[PDB]
Chain A
Amino acid sequence: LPKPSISSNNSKPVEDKDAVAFTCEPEAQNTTYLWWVNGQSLPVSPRLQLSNGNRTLTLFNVTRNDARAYVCGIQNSVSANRSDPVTLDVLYGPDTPIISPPDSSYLSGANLNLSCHSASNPSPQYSWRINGIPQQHTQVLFIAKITPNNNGTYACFVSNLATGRNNSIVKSITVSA
């Protein structure tokens, strides 16, 4: 018996806007099909639906926790056939950016080294603004040999082209001497 194969609605579904579907090839007559989810069979929940007589899988409310391996298997007396595991990639939107040096104050002459982390599925589009004027289009903002009162509000802007949503964090940095 040929090994089953799997096909999907969307190779790269997006969080909170897309819905995925799964179809396994064999579609044999007088046969029963089942689905394995990371080694677990038939998770009973309205979110996961099975239609066309245990043939098509459907998943709504796609979130970042749906990245689980799915397998379609055919159940017969001697079939014992399961498709090769397939991994799903959820294109979830960017989270709240965090600036790794959480100190709100620095010393004179300290090398400003700010790293902005967003933890999105693709690499987020990073931009840095100082007092509202764009400065760079990178993730790490580096300023060396800072001058007293060159301070202000530094903003990391994080963008995702999959969802288009914004996410900006503004932190106030000042130095006395």
Chain B
Amino acid sequence: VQLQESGPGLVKPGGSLSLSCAASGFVFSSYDMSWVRQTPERGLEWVAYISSGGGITYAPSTVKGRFTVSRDNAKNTLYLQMNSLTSEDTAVYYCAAHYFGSSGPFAYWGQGTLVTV
């Protein structure tokens, strides 16, 4: 059960970045995954969701857009795209799988990657 995250790192506030999450040790297609970000001040929060092989997508009510999710099961790679960065977007991001679908707990957490902007 390996889930390795990756990101560009520190970027200009007026720029954009694309995250990646590679998987190994278990079937990527059968598992729904999501994005959880942590800040030392606010804490933990959920910022993205994806279903199996695309399909239904959900985003937090804080920002309707500005978030894109795209998974490739053949490459076992899950990608998150964000633009129009803001000073509150500095956090550490984890890609985490799911049990039972979209109503289950967050299992198989990853090491995660920090990012500031």
Contact = CB atoms under 8 A, between A and B. Distances in A.
Given A142-B29, A142-B30, A137 B104 contact: yes
A112 to B, nearest CB: 11
Contacts of A113: 29
Contact count band on A: 10 to 19
B103 interface: yes
B52 interface: yes
Contact count band on B: 10 to 19
A169 interface: no
Contacts of B31: 138
A127 B53 CA distance: 18
A113 B52 CA distance: 11
A97 interface: no
Contact of B103 (A115, A122, A136, A141): A122
A138 B103 contact: no
A139 B52 contact: yes
A140 interface: yes
A156 B30 CA distance: 14
Contacts of B86: none
B47 to A, nearest CB: 19
Interface of B: 27, 29-32, 52-53, 98-104
Interface of A: 113, 115, 122-127, 136-142, 159
